[PDB]
Structures are given as C-alpha cells and as structure tokens.
C-alpha cells in the first residue's frame, strides 16, 4: 500500500451550491492528473459537473476542484433524486461513492 | 483508537472565546506516531458553514516539529468555523488515515 | 526499460472490513473468533 489517496467532500451535497472538493495523493514522485466528477445515480449517465486537476511536487500533490449540481439538470419527477455519485478517475486510480 | 497507534493531536484549547476577524490564528499540531520518518507533512482543511473554504499542507522541520496552522481568520468564517487536520502514513506494507 | 503512458494501479482499502496483513479483507465478525480466519499469518487473532 505504498501509494495512497484521499478525496474529501461535504457529508451532503447541496444542489445549486459551489461545493469545493480536496484531493491529496501520497507515495507519488512523477506528476499526473485526475478528474473529480459528479455523476447521476444509479446510472452514471449524466456528468453534472467535472473538474480536471494536476498533481505534482510543485502542488505538494494536493489540489481542489469546485463542482456543482445545477438544480435544473436533475431529472425531477414526482419523488426527487436523493443520491448522486462522486467519482474520481486518474492514472493509477478510480473509485466512486454515493 | 488508532489501529496503527499513529495519532495527530491538535494542541489548541478549544476556546469558547472568539478569534477576531482577520487575525493570525496560530495552532500547533503534533503528529505522534511509530512512523514519523514518513510523515513529511500533515494537511489541513478549514470548514465554514458546509464548505471546505481553505485547505493546505504543513511540513516537517529538522527538529521533528511541524509548521503550525498560521492562517488569517478571513471573512468567510465569521459565525464559526471548524478545523480538520489529517495525514496518511505507511508501515512496512499497511497504511492508516490519521 | 520504458517510460509508461499507462500508470501503475493502486490497491483499494478494506473499508469497514478488517484488513489482514497480506492485503486481504475479512469480516469484523472473524476478528478474535478463536480461529485463524486470515490465511497465512493471522492478524485477526492478535492481542485479544
């Protein structure tokens, strides 16, 4: 487990708020990139917001992206969306979480 | 309750008396750990209302002590704010978020 | 030797499961079960 990462985010995303999401990576010695992204749930069909961030010794392998769910881009309907995916993609790793 | 017995203690005194706007807050944080060779820095996030408003990194001095949290308490903090501090450290193969 | 375009993949963590020292994950019901429930060198049995 010599290479590791943390992404940290609000407990609840507020729809229509400019949520700021930090990334930190560890054990890396050549620069790379990541795309912290907010996607529809379950289906991952619609990217609601995405940010692209550079990780390097010059940034001390830390960055943040500012991401939002625009209120009108949600599918709406009779009972409203209660969950969304936060995803990261990068060389070396990807994961997502509800 | 760290499984790795690796800790991060914020030296601050939690005070009910307020910090004044724009003043330099100066907090010490001590990462006591079996693995202090590997904790080259800790990282911090300042949270105001719901949002991570500031973030950064705090490096190891040669005396085996660290950059304090030296931040102006900027206007986005004013009702109250919350500091969180973290690091990941490695054993021989394992890792823990502290 | 070569400079890779594709990067080296990471582990993923055991999350709520107990991490055994190998990197395998087992249920927290098996920690201090009294059986060596991690394969190879048990860790689930440590200091109970």
């Amino acid at each position: 487990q010599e290479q590791t990462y943390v992404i940290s985010a609000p407990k609840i995303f507020r729809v229509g708020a400019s949520e700021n999401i930090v990334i930190q990576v560890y054990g890396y010695t050549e620069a790379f990139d990541a795309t912290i992204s907010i996607k529809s749930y379950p289906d991952k069909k619609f990217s609601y917001s995405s940010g692209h961030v550079h990780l390097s010794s010059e940034n001390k392998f830390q960055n943040s992206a500012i991401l939002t769910i625009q209120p009108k881009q949600l599918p709406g309907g009779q009972n409203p969306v209660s969950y969304v995916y936060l995803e990261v993609v990068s060389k070396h790793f990807s994961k997502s979480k509800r | 309750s760290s499984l790795s017995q690796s800790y991060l203690y914020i030296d601050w005194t939690d005070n009910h008396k307020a910090l004044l706007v724009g003043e330099h807050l100066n907090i010490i944080v001590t990462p006591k750990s079996p693995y202090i060779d590997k904790i080259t820095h800790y990282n911090y996030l300042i949270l105001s209302k719901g949002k991570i408003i500031h973030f950064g990194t705090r490096e190891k001095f040669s005396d085996a002590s660290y950059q304090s949290i030296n931040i102006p308490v900027t206007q986005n903090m004013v009702p109250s704010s919350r500091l969180l501090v973290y690091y990941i450290v490695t054993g021989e193969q394992t890792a823990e978020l502290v | 030797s070569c400079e890779p375009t594709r990067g080296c993949p990471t582990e993923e963590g055991c999350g709520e499961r107990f991490r055994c020292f190998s990197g395998q994950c087992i249920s927290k019901s098996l920690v201090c079960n009294g059986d060596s429930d991690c394969d190879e060198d048990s860790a689930d049995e440590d200091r109970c």
């Binding site: 487990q1 590791t4 943390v6 994961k95 997502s96 | 394992t94 978020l97 | 055991c14």
Partner: peptide, 21 residues
C-alpha cells in the same frame, strides 16, 4: 472521504445532534 488507506465513513450514520458550543 474516499481513500484507499483502509477506512470508510459508510460505517457511520447520523444522530439528531445536540452537543452545544
């Protein structure tokens, strides 16, 4: 948070909190 370093706050769930400041 999302991390590979062996934790997930998915093991925790809220209470109607009342600790005061």
């Amino acid at each position: 948070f999302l991390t590979n370093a062996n934790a997930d706050d998915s093991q925790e769930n809220d209470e109607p909190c009342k600790e005061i400041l």
